[PDB]
Structure 1
Amino acid sequence: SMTKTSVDCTMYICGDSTECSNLLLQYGSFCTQLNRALTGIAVEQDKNTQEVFAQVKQIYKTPPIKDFGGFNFSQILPDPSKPSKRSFIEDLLFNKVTLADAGFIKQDLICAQKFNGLTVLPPLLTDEMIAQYTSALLAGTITSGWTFGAGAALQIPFAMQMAYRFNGIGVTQNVLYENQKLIANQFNSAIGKIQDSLSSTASALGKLQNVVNQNAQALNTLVKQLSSNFGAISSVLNDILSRLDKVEAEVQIDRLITGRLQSLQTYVTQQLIRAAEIRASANLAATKMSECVLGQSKRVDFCGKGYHLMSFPQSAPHGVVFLHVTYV
């Protein structure tokens, strides 16, 4: 997803001016459509979120015994001891991105945004509920293989599922069992290298961070356009109205509407186009969830580089992460 926003167009242009509102009416419904177009964007952020994460209709829980044949999901399963029931790797990913607000109770860029009718809206599914769908998607996988996608959940021993997996990559099921302790240790070592990576490096989440950075910056740009003259005698609306009479104001105010209104249509164009970038990224993420997490993929390099075994999802700010597990 990207950040939800809404923009009280009449506050943005005309913050507490009856005059500016009466003149803004001369351009008919331009604000209405802008409200409707940001509404179209905002509905589809929850669609995008729900398609990626609600790919199951049951909230599967792991058994309390970790009898998984040596593989150590304790770093990707729920930590019960944290109120956010996220994994080890999730709690790294949530530290790495530092969100400029999400709508968590206002009672700084975002004070200015609020005072110009720009509001960040809360997402439909909370980071806890996303972590829960993610916990279910994972807890199904390590107990039920691909079957929990294709119908009712069917239990299977994890080492037996991995045998079928190996058949999926064109490797015969004895090869797993004759090396099972090694295969567990390599998986455990690899999960350890994702931790040791993500904890250390400052460049990893650039793909998500650049989306957030643009959302922040475009709101900051749309704020900063309020400081322009557009050739009027001030950028401050009241410094016009408290200086000039009614007739002489209408020139200056029409200049500010000519500016500000183009300032919104520009942003809402940028946001729409941006939304098409994210809608594709979400439709892809839902596809990878379907085929790599609920499945095993015979598509080359589709589920990370190498012959695909399985994938584990993890949530991140405005995003998802796929731990793709592969035989090389």
Structure 2
Amino acid sequence: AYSNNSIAIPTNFTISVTTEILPVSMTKTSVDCTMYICGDSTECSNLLLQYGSFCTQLNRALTGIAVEQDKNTQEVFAQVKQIYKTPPIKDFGGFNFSQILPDPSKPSKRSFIEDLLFNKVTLADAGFIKDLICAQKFNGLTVLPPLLTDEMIAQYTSALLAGTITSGWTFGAGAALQIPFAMQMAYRFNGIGVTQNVLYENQKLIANQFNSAIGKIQDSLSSTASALGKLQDVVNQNAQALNTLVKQLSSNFGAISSVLNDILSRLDPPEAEVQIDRLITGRLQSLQTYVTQQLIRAAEIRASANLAATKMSECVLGQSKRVDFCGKGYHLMSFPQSAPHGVVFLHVTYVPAQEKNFTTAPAICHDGKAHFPREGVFVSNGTHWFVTQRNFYEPQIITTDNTFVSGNCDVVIGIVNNTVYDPLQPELD
């Protein structure tokens, strides 16, 4: 309902918590040529030496990918190098963090939500010292374990939360400096343009809304199935590619048989060569296709990991002002949690509601002078004129302490008449 002297201002607000999932790394794999192509055969190996250095190149490529994975994880999570702890007493002003802090009653000290996340996703090929698993493995295919176990990533995450809630954004710039939690929240409202006495007078309301939002996250996660699609896709794609690589050992490519020991146990060497060469060509082409597509996927994952590192630096360790970078609304703060092969952010945000209509004006003419607002806007309640801040309706009398003068009142388009009250004269009155 646009009009040239009408404005709408909110009267209440809401605290919103939302989630965001990002992949970080994938599975490290290794493949051996002389086993994949010429398994356990000396004739085949001597025939393969005539191609030179294809196999050295393939191994170098796969090793490069394998190292890059550990680099990704290190960048995302190792943002701190002291392991902070949270005190035993939990007087956090009425906010309740029980469902995201660590829990000692488990062999791995993961929180509640991290357990839900680790049960949602069905990983495979854990890689640790040892089903399509063995059928694959029996042909030169192996899976390597990651450098950071799953119990160290949880320590990193708990350190980040403890620092955030006990010190604020100061531990990301130097030494951690403590400060009560309610005063931290007051600072974070001055960050978005709302005066800070709005928190101290609505503290219980805000605490209750925050707690309820966390509860809804909990059950919505504990019920619905397709929350974590983004991670499951990675797992699936890797499994599928590896499976098709294994299947390609059953094809002829035009020889008499797909089994190398049959070609060797029937024909004499000068005719066995003509057949073995055909097998070698086919299998070599299969490896090259595999390796190329793996390189492209690795590039994709690296891009996503750099994005996650940026979100950690800017949304968790500080307060962001970029729009929609850390959720929908005005950003207040964020918390990290770990999931298999990736990370999950919980964004806490401020959203206004309960708006109303008023008439407005750009300036006030008093005595041939024009007064403008220092900070805020002029509104009319129907008969009277007040000043208010722009994000929360709270009216006040117009005085000479919250307005400033500039010029006469002949040039502004849409100026109105009123009176401006001087605070000193009533003292002199």
Q: TM-score, normalised by structure 1?
A: 0.96
166-175 or 195-204: bigger deviation: 166-175
Q: In 2 relative to 1, CA 160–29 (structure 1 residues): closer, same or farther, beyond 3 Å?
A: same
Q: 1:215-234 to 2 correspondence within 5 Å?
A: 215-234=238-257
Report runs of 4+ in structure 1 exceeding 4 Å deviation: none
> 1:13-47: per-residue Cα shift (whole Å, max 9, x none)?
12222222222222211111111111111111000
Instruction: Return 5+ residue gaps in structure 2 as ranges.
Output: 1-24, 350-429
Structure 1 match to 2:185? 162
Counterpart-to-counterpart distance in 2, 1:237 and 1:146: 65
Counterpart-to-counterpart distance in 2, 1:88 and 1:73: 11
Counterpart-to-counterpart distance in 1, 2:198 and 2:42: 78
Q: In 2 relative to 1, CA 241–81 (structure 1 residues): closer, same or farther, beyond 3 Å?
A: same
209-218 or 176-185: bigger deviation: 176-185
> 1:160-194: per-residue Cα shift (whole Å, max 9, x none)?
11111112222222222211222222121111111
> 1:284-327: per-residue Cα shift (whole Å, max 9, x none)?
0111111111111101111122211111110111101111111x
Structure 2 match to 1:83? 107
Q: In 2 relative to 1, CA 293–244 (structure 1 residues): closer, same or farther, beyond 3 Å?
A: farther
Counterpart-to-counterpart distance in 2, 1:220 and 1:45: 21
Helix, strand or coil: the match of 1:250? Answer: helix
Instruction: Return 5+ residue gaps in structure 1 as ranges.
Output: none
Helix, strand or coil: the match of 1:22? Answer: helix
Helix, strand or coil: the match of 1:204? Answer: helix
57-66 or 275-284: bigger deviation: 57-66
Counterpart-to-counterpart distance in 1, 2:279 and 2:178: 66
Deviation at 1:208, TM superposition (A): 0.6
Structure 2 match to 1:101? 125
Q: In 2 relative to 1, CA 170–242 (structure 1 residues): closer, same or farther, beyond 3 Å?
A: farther
Helix, strand or coil: the match of 1:273? Answer: helix
Counterpart-to-counterpart distance in 2, 1:152 and 1:309: 22
Helix, strand or coil: the match of 1:14? Answer: coil
Deviation at 1:101, TM superposition (A): 1.9
Counterpart-to-counterpart distance in 1, 2:195 and 2:34: 67
Q: In 2 relative to 1, CA 246–206 (structure 1 residues): closer, same or farther, beyond 3 Å?
A: same
Q: TM-score, normalised by structure 2?
A: 0.74
Q: In 2 relative to 1, CA 246–306 (structure 1 residues): closer, same or farther, beyond 3 Å?
A: farther
> 1:204-257: per-residue Cα shift (whole Å, max 9, x none)?
100011011101111111111111211122222222222322222222222222
Structure 1 match to 2:33? 9
Percent sequence identity is 99
Helix, strand or coil: the match of 2:243? Answer: helix
Check if 1:56 corresponds to 2:80. Answer: yes
Bigger strand fraction = 2
Q: Size of the alignment, in residue pairs?
A: 325
Deviation at 1:55, TM superposition (A): 0.8
Counterpart-to-counterpart distance in 1, 2:160 and 2:144: 27
